[PDB]
Amino acid sequence: ADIEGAIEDYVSSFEEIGTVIDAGDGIAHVEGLPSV
């Protein structure tokens, strides 16, 4: 019930910094940056 609202609220909330989690030979994966 409140989960949908609560979860939705989260999506809504979103100078923002992400972090590299993988990297290799040209391709790098960056977690975060929700508004990229």
């Binding site: 989960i3 979860i7 609220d9 989260y10 909330s13 975060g32």
Partner: protein, 50 residues
């Protein structure tokens, strides 16, 4: 301690049931504020403090 165990089991059940809730409460984001905000919002008054 018994209440703490029961409430921790209850939140475990909630996380298992709400897969989306578990996934955002588990995202590897460094920002904790948003997460904690979702947390309390959905469970702050329903569980003890400890």
């Amino acid at each position: 301690l018994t209440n703490l165990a029961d409430e921790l089991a209850s939140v475990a059940k909630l996380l298992l049931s709400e897969t989306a809730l578990n996934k955002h409460l588990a995202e590897p984001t460094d920002d904790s504020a948003p997460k904690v905000r979702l947390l309390e919002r959905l469970l702050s008054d329903k569980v003890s403090a400890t």
